[PDB]
Design an enzyme around this catalytic site. Structure first.
Site, PDB file in Angstrom:
ATOM      1  N   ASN A 132       0.821  -1.170   0.000  1.00 60.86           N
ATOM      2  CA  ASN A 132       0.000   0.000   0.000  1.00 60.86           C
ATOM      3  C   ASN A 132       0.882   1.258   0.000  1.00 60.86           C
ATOM      4  O   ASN A 132       1.813   1.336   0.805  1.00 60.86           O
ATOM      5  CB  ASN A 132      -0.778   0.010   1.320  1.00 60.86           C
TER       6      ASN A 132
ATOM      7  N   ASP B 237       5.760  -4.776   2.520  1.00 57.16           N
ATOM      8  CA  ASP B 237       4.465  -4.308   3.071  1.00 57.16           C
ATOM      9  C   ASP B 237       3.311  -5.339   2.894  1.00 57.16           C
ATOM     10  O   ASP B 237       3.488  -6.509   3.227  1.00 57.16           O
ATOM     11  CB  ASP B 237       4.160  -2.901   2.430  1.00 57.16           C
ATOM     12  N   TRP B 238       2.146  -4.947   2.381  1.00 57.58           N
ATOM     13  CA  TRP B 238       1.035  -5.955   2.214  1.00 57.58           C
ATOM     14  C   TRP B 238       1.379  -7.042   1.183  1.00 57.58           C
ATOM     15  O   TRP B 238       0.867  -8.135   1.253  1.00 57.58           O
ATOM     16  CB  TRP B 238      -0.288  -5.282   1.868  1.00 57.58           C
TER      17      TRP B 238
ATOM     18  N   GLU C  17      10.984  -4.277   4.787  1.00 54.05           N
ATOM     19  CA  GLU C  17       9.871  -3.513   5.353  1.00 54.05           C
ATOM     20  C   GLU C  17       8.554  -4.308   5.286  1.00 54.05           C
ATOM     21  O   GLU C  17       7.537  -3.863   4.774  1.00 54.05           O
ATOM     22  CB  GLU C  17       9.758  -2.122   4.668  1.00 54.05           C
TER      23      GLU C  17
ATOM     24  N   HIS D  37      10.382   3.548   4.508  1.00 55.67           N
ATOM     25  CA  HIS D  37       9.481   2.375   4.273  1.00 55.67           C
ATOM     26  C   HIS D  37       9.588   1.857   2.831  1.00 55.67           C
ATOM     27  O   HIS D  37       9.743   0.630   2.615  1.00 55.67           O
ATOM     28  CB  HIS D  37       8.029   2.691   4.567  1.00 55.67           C
TER      29      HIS D  37
HETATM   30 CL   LIG Z   1      -1.164  -0.003   5.164  1.00 58.75          CL
END
Ligand SMILES: [Cl-]
Length: 293
Positions: A38, A103-104, A127, A269
């Protein structure tokens, strides 16, 4: 650092919707599957892929509701992404893969690896998502904002109505300044405010302070798998990082089997926007030793 996206579009129809993906490189080997999070898309991997494509197929899908993929009116729960990505991987007839995840995209990739461990020859990650057991374990600078995101009123107003995930969080997770051309490539999928649903549901799905309980349990489960798995792992980290600060990277170097860590220098990030060259060159250098069974 390149701002262009010189990849021809490919599309596959899964579960009633078209998913767009990058697909470059030779077809006769083990492909490398890049999963963004995201609020990004395959655009995040644009400067990493060219390091890997000379030796390996690179496939980089846009998650449903994102990038150039179709944008059905879904709730965009993690479970929805799981269905779409599982079907994507089967529609492309992928057998064994190497994962490159963030991330996702890392929650999806670790959840798919745990469920298909014989099909994963290596995991490069950065990350990534693990449980954040209390709010004090979320980065202090981002705490007020993500608490606000995780409401039905304020969070929707910030993310959907005002586009905060694209206009504030994204640039704030890169050390260097993003250019307007780069910002336009990331704004493109979300020009219509109503299409921002996945950008709001995702922070509401993060496993923070025990909530939501279903994601906390699923992420606990793939972390327990990852800690016991002999799969080769390549972990990129930066300073100060966000989800994975330097001391946590050091801890993971020790607690995850067969894990190589790479310091990318400054990073928050979206490490791919700060040091894509080192990320891509180190993934390319790491692939050959994974081939043998
Ligand atoms: Cl998020």
């Amino acid at each position: 650092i390149g701002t262009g996206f010189p990849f021809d579009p490919h599309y596959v129809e899964v579960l009633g919707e078209r998913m767009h993906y990058v697909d470059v490189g030779p077809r006769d080997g083990t492909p490398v599957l890049f999963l963004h999070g995201n609020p990004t898309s395959s655009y995040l991997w644009r400067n990493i892929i060219p390091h890997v494509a000379p030796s390996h197929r690179c496939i980089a899908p846009d998650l449903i509701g994102m990038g150039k993929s179709d944008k059905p009116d879904l709730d965009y729960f993690f479970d929805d992404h799981v269905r779409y990505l599982d079907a994507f991987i089967e529609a492309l007839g992928l057998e064994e893969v190497v994962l490159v995840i963030h991330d996702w995209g890392s929650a999806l990739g670790f959840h798919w690896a745990k469920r298909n461990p014989e099909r994963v020859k290596g995991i490069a990650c950065m990350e990534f998502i693990r449980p954040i057991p209390t709010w004090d374990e979320w980065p202090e600078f981002a705490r007020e904002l993500f608490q606000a995101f995780r409401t039905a009123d304020v969070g929707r107003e910030l993310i959907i109505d005002q586009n905060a995930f694209i206009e504030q969080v994204l640039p704030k997770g890169v050390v260097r300044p993003l250019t307007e051309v780069e910002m336009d490539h990331y704004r493109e999928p979300f020009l219509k405010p109503v299409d921002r649903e996945p950008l709001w549901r995702f922070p509401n799905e993060l496993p923070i302070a025990g909530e939501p309980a279903n994601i906390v349990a699923l992420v606990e489960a793939y972390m327990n798998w990852l800690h016991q798995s002999p799969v080769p792992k390549l972990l990129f980290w930066g300073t100060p990082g966000v989800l994975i600060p330097p001391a946590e990277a050091a801890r993971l170097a020790e607690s995850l089997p067969n894990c190589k860590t790479v310091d990318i220098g400054p990073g928050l990030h979206y490490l791919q926007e700060d040091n894509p060259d080192l990320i891509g060159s180190e993934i390319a250098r790491w692939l050959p030793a994974l081939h043998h069974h």
